[PDB]
Amino acid sequence: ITGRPEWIWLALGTALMGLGTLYFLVKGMGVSDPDAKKFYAITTLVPAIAFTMYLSMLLGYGLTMVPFGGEQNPIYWARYADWLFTTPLLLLDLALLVDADQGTILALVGADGIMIGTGLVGALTKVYSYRFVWWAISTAAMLYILYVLFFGFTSKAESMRPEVASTFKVLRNVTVVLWSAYPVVWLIGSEGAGIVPLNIETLLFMVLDVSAKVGFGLILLRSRAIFGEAE
Amino acid sequence: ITGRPEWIWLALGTALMGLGTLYFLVKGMGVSDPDAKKFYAITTLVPAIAFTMYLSMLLGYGLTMVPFGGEQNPIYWARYADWLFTTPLLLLDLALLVDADQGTILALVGADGIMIGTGLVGALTKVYSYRFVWWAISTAAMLYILYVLFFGFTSKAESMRPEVASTFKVLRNVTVVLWSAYPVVWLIGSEGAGIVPLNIETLLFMVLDVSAKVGFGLILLRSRAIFGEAE
Amino acid sequence: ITGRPEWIWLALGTALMGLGTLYFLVKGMGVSDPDAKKFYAITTLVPAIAFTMYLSMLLGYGLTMVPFGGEQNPIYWARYADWLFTTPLLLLDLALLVDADQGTILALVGADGIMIGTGLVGALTKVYSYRFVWWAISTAAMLYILYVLFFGFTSKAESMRPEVASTFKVLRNVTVVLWSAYPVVWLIGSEGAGIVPLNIETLLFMVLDVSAKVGFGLILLRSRAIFGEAE
Ligand SMILES: CC(C)CCC[C@@H](C)CCC[C@@H](C)CCC[C@@H](C)CCOC[C@@H](CO)OCC[C@H](C)CCC[C@H](C)CCC[C@H](C)CCCC(C)C
Ligand SMILES: CC(C)CCC[C@@H](C)CCC[C@@H](C)CCC[C@@H](C)CCOC[C@@H](CO)OCC[C@H](C)CCC[C@H](C)CCC[C@H](C)CCCC(C)C
Ligand SMILES: CC(C)CCC[C@@H](C)CCC[C@@H](C)CCC[C@@H](C)CCOC[C@@H](CO)OCC[C@H](C)CCC[C@H](C)CCC[C@H](C)CCCC(C)C
Ligand SMILES: *C/C=C(C)/C=C/C=C(C)/C=C/C1=C(C)CCCC1(C)C
Ligand SMILES: *C/C=C(C)/C=C/C=C(C)/C=C/C1=C(C)CCCC1(C)C
Ligand SMILES: *C/C=C(C)/C=C/C=C(C)/C=C/C1=C(C)CCCC1(C)C
Ligand SMILES: CCCCCCCCCCCCCCC
Ligand SMILES: CCCCCCCCCCCCCCC
Ligand SMILES: CCCCCCCCCCCCCCC
Ligand SMILES: CCCCCCCCCCCCCC
Ligand SMILES: CCCCCCCCCCCCCC
Ligand SMILES: CCCCCCCCCCCCCC
Ligand SMILES: CCCCCCCCCCCCC
Ligand SMILES: CCCCCCCCCCCCC
Ligand SMILES: CCCCCCCCCCCCC
Ligand SMILES: CCCCCCCCCCC
Ligand SMILES: CCCCCCCCCCC
Ligand SMILES: CCCCCCCCCCC
Ligand SMILES: CCCCCCCCCCC
Ligand SMILES: CCCCCCCCCC
Ligand SMILES: CCCCCCCCCC
Ligand SMILES: CCCCCCCCCC
Ligand SMILES: CCCCCCCCC
Ligand SMILES: CCCCCCCCC
Ligand SMILES: CCCCCCCCC
Ligand SMILES: CCCCCCCC
Ligand SMILES: CCCCCCCC
Ligand SMILES: CCCCCCCC
Ligand SMILES: CCCCCCCC
Ligand SMILES: CCCCCCCC
Ligand SMILES: CCCCCCCC
Ligand SMILES: CCCCCCCC
Ligand SMILES: CCCCCCCC
Ligand SMILES: CCCCCCCC
């Protein structure tokens, strides 16, 4: 395990996701409100899935070698397995907060699936120049998602409770900033142009992942917006 | 890319799915009705997914070699990845049109999953005679789906709005004819008996795919059946 | 096929799932009640999926070799493909019976996904001692599911119809006993410590699978709890 310099960040990531999972699990024990239960379920599952995939990367299972540029390049494929399930759960948290219509939710989840799926294909593609074609398609799917979060959701939040409108606005802003960093790190890291070494890349993704999951969850689950308006 | 004679049909397929995706995306921009949004979301996602998988076939990612009959046989596995997601979306379009009950929808999607999954296993099976066992099981799942579309849905459409009944009937008929061709092409093509060469097989699937997705979508999204009855 | 001593149990399993599938399919033909249709759909799909995966194991497709302990160890990976889809369907049968809230259903299905997914990783892991780390995480996800079935569902059933409360209690008890045997068989069988040989392991899983699917389904589909209260 320690044979890879990036192991320290995989281990820290595993620990922080594990701790985040346990914290949300305990916190949600005292919850009976049916609406709050939905948000706790979604939000606890996110770091639990990430915990398993960080562990698989730490132990070496979630790593494969991909030939491109005349080299055997270490590619952590387990990231995409994580993201396939956790990024639509994160979007679902946002969509339920603002009572999004079903068509909009399906558009978001579908675009998200395309985003992660094409990122996976790009990560595993052996023809170097083609990796960036997949990156571009994935990034276009991301831009669609960000567009919807701003010009379909923000003006939906404003007709809702003030506490859900303010909580949505904060989580929207956190999401757009954090999620936009992922394609940049991929592009300059070992999957793309290879300018930033894998150990630093792994650190960067770990900070983004913990912030986008445990950070996000801490903000959401401390808000009164997750509860039905009750006396 | 041009090293494979079937590349021209993969390229045309990619282009037509891409163009179809953009057309539906633009067309649905001016839509606020919650019901119509569902149909636009579902129907736009279908060629978008197909676009990505056609591209993966064009670039060579979605192709593998399978030993059977003492030969290395080129198998485009990306078709099944496409179909796994797009065929239940197509069925969902039909089921929502007639306000199908939840049990019926689950039966359809489940049978569809079995249909595509067993087709994939058959496509990748190395014992030649066993490929046709999987083809038979998949075809039985197809026949179940077609049965339900006729003797569970058609008489559901007739108690609904005339515009939804007439639109459903047309899309049902398009679906049954087009979908029934797929097992025949598989059986006589490079996956099955090998009587029709891969380049012609690829052409045939491209015509079926564009018709079943973009053709289907053009009929559906031009109907007033996708809108709630409103003043 | 007969080259593997466990083939007889794979063949019997295939037959019993096939027969169970046909029986439930015929039985549900005379059903119009929308609630009952849901239970028939879910419950018929379960042995149908299991039939396909038992067949893939019989024909040899669903088997791979995994190096650990200095040996090539036969691992039937198709079990996890089965279980990935059938165990959440089984939980859905239980959850719908007691009209579980959406948050609880998502927690169950999510924990179940983690349970099966980590079992799959453990089954395919090449470092022997690490296989048991994945077994432990999977078992913890199982224990969560069993906890919810007892201390979240049982007291939900009691405020419902007596026929649904009594049917739920029986199916809950069947589920907890049968499902708890699976991690034990894995641990002592060819995936784990290797004390029980593969042919006996295969027998054990076949008895558990038929009981947990066809047995379970026979109890559920003969109950009046699956019908809406109607005059
Ligand atoms: C509604 C939304 C969910 C829409 C989803 C959007 C989605 C369509 C976007 C594209 C997804 C698609 C790229 C998934 C591809 C998975 C694939 C990378 C798995 C690895 O297999 C690739 C090659 C080795 O590189 O296998 C070597 C050759 C092997 C023989 C491969 C044969 C097995 C195939 C992988 C079977 C395909 C199954 C499905 C792709 C399962 C989807 C997995 C998940 C990653 C989407
Ligand atoms: C409700 C509905 C959805 C019901 C669904 C119906 C469904 C049950 C029908 C059968 C689906 C099942 C056949 C999927 C099999 C996928 C498999 C072909 C992927 C390729 O792996 C096959 C061999 C190489 O040929 O791998 C070589 C050996 C490797 C070590 C394989 C180990 C990895 C396994 C593939 C893990 C299994 C994961 C699940 C099958 C994911 C499902 C993928 C999708 C195609 C259904
Ligand atoms: C809401 C709930 C559903 C939550 C779900 C919980 C879930 C997160 C729990 C963990 C699931 C995760 C372990 C699935 C891993 C599948 C993996 C074993 C498939 C086989 O690939 C493993 C190695 C060979 O051993 O591939 C060799 C290297 C290859 C290059 C691998 C590259 C292809 C990757 C497999 C692509 C990943 C796609 C997704 C994992 C699809 C999920 C399949 C299913 C088994 C969950
Ligand atoms: C918890 C993990 C999260 C929130 C991950 C988010 C990841 C993305 C938004 C990834 C986006 C990518 C692209 C837009 C193109 C390049 C490849 C990706 C997959 C890194
Ligand atoms: C957009 C793509 C569509 C509508 C594809 C439909 C495909 C089928 C109905 C495929 C059916 C098959 C069988 C019935 C058995 C042989 C294998 C298949 C998968 C080709
Ligand atoms: C129809 C099949 C059923 C009901 C299978 C149930 C399987 C399980 C509950 C498996 C549990 C496992 C663990 C808890 C850890 C070890 C690995 C598994 C996957 C066997
Ligand atoms: C969105 C953030 C992307 C920028 C990442 C900056 C990383 C700077 C680290 C120094 C680069 C290491 C190069 C020498 C090894
Ligand atoms: C459902 C349509 C299946 C029939 C396809 C007919 C294809 C005819 C093309 C000629 C066959 C090529 C054989 C000589 C290369
Ligand atoms: C939950 C049941 C697990 C116990 C399984 C008992 C199997 C006993 C069979 C005898 C073991 C075979 C060892 C000699 C080959
Ligand atoms: C490819 C995996 C996509 C599914 C991820 C799980 C999250 C799905 C959330 C469903 C949202 C509800 C839509 C109506
Ligand atoms: C194996 C992939 C199956 C899922 C495909 C996505 C479409 C699912 C549509 C869900 C229909 C709603 C059922 C209640
Ligand atoms: C990884 C596969 C998980 C999906 C299995 C299919 C069963 C899903 C049942 C959905 C229950 C409804 C939740 C709201
Ligand atoms: C186009 C929608 C406006 C809100 C999205 C902001 C786009 C940020 C760009 C992210 C950088 C990705 C490379
Ligand atoms: C049995 C249901 C009647 C409607 C379905 C028509 C079946 C068409 C056969 C398709 C050919 C597949 C090989
Ligand atoms: C902790 C919840 C109480 C009900 C679950 C009973 C646990 C049975 C243990 C199963 C054995 C697995 C190794
Ligand atoms: C070796 C790099 C070749 C450049 C490929 C860039 C493709 C980016 C596509 C953006 C439309
Ligand atoms: C393919 C990228 C699309 C980003 C711009 C959004 C187009 C308008 C969509 C309106 C729902
Ligand atoms: C080499 C071909 C052997 C014939 C197999 C046909 C099987 C079809 C099954 C239909 C019930
Ligand atoms: C070779 C076996 C080494 C023992 C591993 C047991 C790990 C079990 C983890 C339970 C917390
Ligand atoms: C509760 C702490 C969980 C941390 C387990 C994984 C950390 C890796 C240590 C090497
Ligand atoms: C908008 C046109 C999209 C076409 C891109 C793929 C066509 C392949 C050209 C070689
Ligand atoms: C209807 C009987 C189904 C049995 C088919 C599979 C049994 C395997 C026989 C070798
Ligand atoms: C993006 C950083 C999130 C910070 C989380 C802090 C949570 C405290 C309530
Ligand atoms: C099956 C062929 C479909 C033809 C689509 C034409 C759409 C015009 C409205
Ligand atoms: C766990 C054993 C189940 C027994 C099923 C018998 C069904 C008869 C109604
Ligand atoms: C990591 C366990 C958290 C302890 C409880 C925190 C207050 C709910
Ligand atoms: C008003 C919300 C500001 C949140 C910005 C957080 C940036 C990481
Ligand atoms: C809305 C601001 C987006 C900031 C992008 C930051 C990418 C590192
Ligand atoms: C391909 C872009 C379509 C242009 C608009 C067509 C009329 C909505
Ligand atoms: C009355 C509907 C006829 C549609 C037939 C289309 C055949 C491709
Ligand atoms: C309902 C008519 C079906 C026609 C099947 C055509 C197969 C090529
Ligand atoms: C296996 C076929 C079952 C025959 C009908 C049983 C009574 C519904
Ligand atoms: C009162 C229900 C008892 C069911 C026990 C079944 C054990 C297999
Ligand atoms: C509730 C009793 C569980 C029995 C476990 C049996 C495991 C073989």
Short mmCIF file of C-alpha atoms in Angstrom, two decimals, chain B residues 64-226:
data_model
loop_
_atom_site.label_atom_id
_atom_site.label_comp_id
_atom_site.label_asym_id
_atom_site.label_seq_id
_atom_site.Cartn_x
_atom_site.Cartn_y
_atom_site.Cartn_z
CA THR B 64 -14.14 -6.20 -28.71
CA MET B 65 -12.98 -9.48 -30.25
CA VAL B 66 -14.80 -12.69 -29.32
CA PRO B 67 -13.46 -16.14 -30.17
CA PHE B 68 -16.07 -18.47 -31.62
CA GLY B 69 -16.27 -20.68 -34.69
CA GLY B 70 -12.47 -20.77 -34.58
CA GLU B 71 -12.27 -17.08 -35.47
CA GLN B 72 -11.75 -13.72 -33.79
CA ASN B 73 -15.12 -12.11 -34.33
CA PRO B 74 -15.59 -8.32 -34.05
CA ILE B 75 -18.41 -7.62 -31.57
CA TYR B 76 -19.63 -4.09 -30.93
CA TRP B 77 -20.52 -4.35 -27.25
CA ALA B 78 -21.38 -0.64 -26.99
CA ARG B 79 -24.75 -1.33 -28.63
CA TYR B 80 -25.90 -3.11 -25.48
CA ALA B 81 -24.69 -0.29 -23.24
CA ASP B 82 -26.80 2.05 -25.38
CA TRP B 83 -29.84 -0.21 -25.46
CA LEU B 84 -29.68 -0.97 -21.71
CA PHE B 85 -30.61 2.65 -21.03
CA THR B 86 -32.46 3.80 -24.15
CA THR B 87 -34.95 0.96 -24.57
CA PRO B 88 -36.48 1.38 -21.12
CA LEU B 89 -36.65 5.16 -21.71
CA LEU B 90 -38.54 4.50 -24.94
CA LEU B 91 -40.96 2.17 -23.09
CA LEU B 92 -41.37 4.81 -20.37
CA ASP B 93 -42.45 7.34 -23.06
CA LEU B 94 -45.14 4.88 -24.12
CA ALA B 95 -46.19 3.97 -20.58
CA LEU B 96 -46.54 7.61 -19.44
CA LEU B 97 -48.58 8.43 -22.52
CA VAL B 98 -51.28 5.99 -21.38
CA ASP B 99 -50.83 6.56 -17.63
CA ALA B 100 -49.77 2.98 -17.03
CA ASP B 101 -49.97 1.65 -13.48
CA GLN B 102 -46.69 1.21 -11.60
CA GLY B 103 -46.75 -2.61 -11.60
CA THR B 104 -47.03 -2.68 -15.38
CA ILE B 105 -44.16 -0.23 -15.81
CA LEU B 106 -41.91 -2.32 -13.57
CA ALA B 107 -42.83 -5.47 -15.51
CA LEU B 108 -41.96 -3.74 -18.79
CA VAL B 109 -38.66 -2.26 -17.62
CA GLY B 110 -37.69 -5.53 -15.94
CA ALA B 111 -38.46 -7.65 -18.99
CA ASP B 112 -36.55 -5.10 -21.10
CA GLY B 113 -33.52 -5.40 -18.82
CA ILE B 114 -33.62 -9.16 -19.17
CA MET B 115 -33.95 -8.79 -22.96
CA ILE B 116 -30.87 -6.58 -23.31
CA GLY B 117 -28.83 -8.34 -20.62
CA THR B 118 -29.31 -11.78 -22.14
CA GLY B 119 -28.57 -10.36 -25.60
CA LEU B 120 -25.25 -9.08 -24.22
CA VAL B 121 -24.38 -12.46 -22.73
CA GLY B 122 -25.25 -14.13 -26.04
CA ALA B 123 -23.09 -11.65 -27.93
CA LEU B 124 -20.08 -12.41 -25.73
CA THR B 125 -20.57 -16.18 -25.38
CA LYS B 126 -17.66 -18.26 -26.74
CA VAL B 127 -19.53 -21.55 -27.21
CA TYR B 128 -21.25 -21.05 -30.58
CA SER B 129 -24.36 -23.16 -30.02
CA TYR B 130 -25.00 -21.45 -26.65
CA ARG B 131 -25.21 -18.00 -28.29
CA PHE B 132 -28.57 -19.04 -29.71
CA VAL B 133 -29.86 -20.20 -26.34
CA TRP B 134 -29.39 -16.65 -25.06
CA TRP B 135 -30.96 -15.25 -28.26
CA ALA B 136 -34.05 -17.40 -27.59
CA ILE B 137 -34.44 -16.25 -23.96
CA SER B 138 -33.99 -12.59 -25.03
CA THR B 139 -36.57 -13.03 -27.79
CA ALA B 140 -39.03 -14.49 -25.29
CA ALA B 141 -38.58 -11.37 -23.12
CA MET B 142 -39.20 -9.25 -26.22
CA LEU B 143 -42.40 -11.15 -26.99
CA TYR B 144 -43.63 -10.48 -23.45
CA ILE B 145 -43.02 -6.76 -23.93
CA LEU B 146 -44.85 -6.73 -27.27
CA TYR B 147 -47.74 -8.67 -25.71
CA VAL B 148 -48.09 -6.08 -22.95
CA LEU B 149 -47.94 -3.19 -25.44
CA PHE B 150 -50.94 -4.70 -27.25
CA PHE B 151 -53.07 -6.48 -24.66
CA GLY B 152 -52.43 -4.24 -21.68
CA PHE B 153 -51.82 -0.79 -23.14
CA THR B 154 -53.95 -0.48 -26.28
CA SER B 155 -57.17 -0.97 -24.32
CA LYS B 156 -55.82 1.48 -21.74
CA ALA B 157 -55.32 4.17 -24.38
CA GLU B 158 -58.95 3.96 -25.51
CA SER B 159 -60.28 5.22 -22.16
CA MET B 160 -57.95 8.21 -22.40
CA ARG B 161 -57.98 11.44 -24.47
CA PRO B 162 -58.45 10.87 -28.23
CA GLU B 163 -55.17 12.65 -28.97
CA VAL B 164 -53.26 10.38 -26.62
CA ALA B 165 -55.06 7.30 -27.93
CA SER B 166 -54.23 8.09 -31.54
CA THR B 167 -50.64 9.09 -30.79
CA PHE B 168 -50.11 5.97 -28.68
CA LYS B 169 -51.49 3.73 -31.43
CA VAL B 170 -49.08 5.17 -34.00
CA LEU B 171 -46.04 4.93 -31.70
CA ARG B 172 -47.03 1.42 -30.61
CA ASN B 173 -47.16 0.30 -34.23
CA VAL B 174 -43.82 1.95 -35.05
CA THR B 175 -42.27 0.31 -31.99
CA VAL B 176 -43.53 -3.23 -32.63
CA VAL B 177 -42.38 -3.26 -36.26
CA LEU B 178 -38.98 -1.67 -35.68
CA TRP B 179 -38.11 -3.56 -32.50
CA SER B 180 -39.01 -6.93 -34.04
CA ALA B 181 -36.35 -6.44 -36.71
CA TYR B 182 -33.49 -6.32 -34.18
CA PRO B 183 -33.47 -10.04 -33.24
CA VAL B 184 -33.60 -10.97 -36.93
CA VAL B 185 -30.58 -8.83 -37.83
CA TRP B 186 -28.63 -10.24 -34.85
CA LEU B 187 -29.49 -13.81 -35.85
CA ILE B 188 -28.37 -13.48 -39.48
CA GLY B 189 -25.52 -11.06 -38.79
CA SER B 190 -22.02 -11.37 -37.36
CA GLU B 191 -23.30 -12.13 -33.85
CA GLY B 192 -25.31 -15.12 -35.04
CA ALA B 193 -25.22 -17.20 -38.22
CA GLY B 194 -22.86 -14.81 -40.04
CA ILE B 195 -24.77 -14.78 -43.34
CA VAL B 196 -24.91 -10.99 -43.62
CA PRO B 197 -21.51 -9.26 -43.34
CA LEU B 198 -20.73 -6.79 -40.53
CA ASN B 199 -20.75 -3.71 -42.74
CA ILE B 200 -24.29 -4.40 -43.97
CA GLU B 201 -25.38 -5.41 -40.45
CA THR B 202 -24.06 -2.06 -39.18
CA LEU B 203 -26.06 -0.20 -41.83
CA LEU B 204 -29.22 -2.09 -40.88
CA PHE B 205 -28.88 -1.30 -37.16
CA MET B 206 -28.15 2.34 -37.98
CA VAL B 207 -31.38 2.70 -39.96
CA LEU B 208 -33.36 0.92 -37.23
CA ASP B 209 -31.74 2.97 -34.44
CA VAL B 210 -32.35 6.36 -36.09
CA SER B 211 -35.94 5.40 -36.92
CA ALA B 212 -36.66 3.98 -33.45
CA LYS B 213 -35.17 7.00 -31.67
CA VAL B 214 -35.20 10.15 -33.78
CA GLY B 215 -38.16 8.99 -35.91
CA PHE B 216 -40.13 7.97 -32.82
CA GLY B 217 -39.19 11.24 -31.08
CA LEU B 218 -40.30 13.40 -34.00
CA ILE B 219 -43.77 11.80 -33.94
CA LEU B 220 -44.13 12.05 -30.17
CA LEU B 221 -42.87 15.60 -29.65
CA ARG B 222 -45.09 17.04 -32.39
CA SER B 223 -48.22 15.67 -30.74
CA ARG B 224 -50.49 17.59 -28.41
CA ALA B 225 -50.83 14.43 -26.36
CA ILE B 226 -47.69 15.32 -24.42
#
